[PDB]
Every structure is written in structure tokens, then in C-alpha cells.
Amino acid sequence: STPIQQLLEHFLRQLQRKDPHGFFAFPVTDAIAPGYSMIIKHPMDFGTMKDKIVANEYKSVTEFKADFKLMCDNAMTYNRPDTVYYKLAKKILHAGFKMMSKER
Amino acid sequence: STPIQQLLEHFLRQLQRKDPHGFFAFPVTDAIAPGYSMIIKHPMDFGTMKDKIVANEYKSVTEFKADFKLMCDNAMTYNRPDTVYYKLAKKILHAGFKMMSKERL
């Protein structure tokens, strides 16, 4: 129940609110996205990021952002620009970096 | 705030709870589903069904079911069986038939 665990849970909820349909909520499977596990080797989702917040695995804000950036980068690498998953990733990426940089 | 509006809102919430990702929450567009407007001429969603519940446009349970059936049928007509949207429609269909069968008491 640390001061960082407070801060990252606050950050996560605010980002999860930008994903109302829950595309970033758990891992993408090959059933719904063919070839995903071959193309993306470092998968990331909000679900996984929450499990790391409970298990206290984030030592800094930057470690949280790193995963956040990875999730969005995976989306913008696997999906074409015309897709909803891509566009959502790009918005959410930009919004997330403004939401948790140079603040107090 | 009628006795039918109570009943249909209860029905709607129970079905909407089976669609956590909200694929049935507003109209499908051709941007996300190519050729949808050519294949499906009578689109229906939970959003539209909620607007009709507020504006009291459902005179009976059967009028509600009719739309419910249309939404699910559109899904099972446009999408292939192996897709997420199909399987979700088929579950939601079956759940509605049990929820609103001839035994409503």
C-alpha cells in the first residue's frame, strides 16, 4: 500500500477510462488476431499492468510508463492505421505521456 | 415510469451485462464493418433500444423482443460463426429467449 502503488493505481484508472470497450484489458489472442504471438513478443495489457501494481513490481513511474508505451507500440505495430485499435493506441499514448510527465 | 418501462429496463440491463465490451452499445459503422449498410438494412443496438425505453415507444414485451431478435439476427447474418460478434449474439439470443419466454408469470 505504498505511495508509488497509490500513484500508479490512480494513473491506471485514468487510462482505463480512455478504453471504455476494453481492448487493452487482457491479452490479445491469435484466435481474435491471427499471427499476433509471432509478430509481438513482448505483449502488454492493462490487466497485466494491474497484477504488477498488486505485486508491487513497479519501482518507479518510468517502469510503469515503459509498459504503457510497450502496449501502445504493440498495437501500432500489429494493427494498420485505419483500424480502431491503432487509433485508440495513438490517442491513449499521447494522453498518457502528458498525464504523467513533469508533474507534482 | 410505467410498469412496462420497469420491466423492459430490467430486461435490458440483464442483457447489456452480457456485453461488457459494448459491441451492441451503439450502431455498427462501415468504417469498422465493411459493407454493413449494404448487407443489413434494419440495424439495431442497445443504444437505440434505450432511447425507445425512455421515449416509452414499447407497447408490449413482444415489441422489445422483436428489436432484441433483430439485433442478434443482424449479427448472426453479417458475421461468420467463428467471430466474437457472432458468438456473443448467439449467447445473448439464447439468454433472452429464457429470460422472456411464455412463462413470464
Ligand SMILES: CCC(=O)c1cc(-c2cc(OC)c(Cn3ccnc3)c(OC)c2)c2ccccn12
Ligand atoms: C489493443 C490490442 C489490439 O491490438 C487488439 C485488441 C483487440 C480486441 C481485444 C479484446 O479484448 C481484450 C476484445 C474483446 N474480446 C476478446 C475475447 N472476447 C472478447 C476484442 O473484441 C473484438 C478485440 C483486438 C482484436 C483484433 C486485432 C487487434 N486487437
Ligand SMILES: CCC(=O)c1cc(-c2cc(OC)c(Cn3ccnc3)c(OC)c2)c2ccccn12
Ligand atoms: C454486434 C454488432 C457487430 O456485428 C459488430 C460490432 C462491432 C463492433 C462495435 C463497436 O461499437 C459498438 C466497437 C467499438 N468501437 C468502434 C469504434 N470505436 C469503438 C467494436 O470494436 C472494434 C466492434 C463490430 C465490428 C466488426 C464487425 C462486426 N461488429
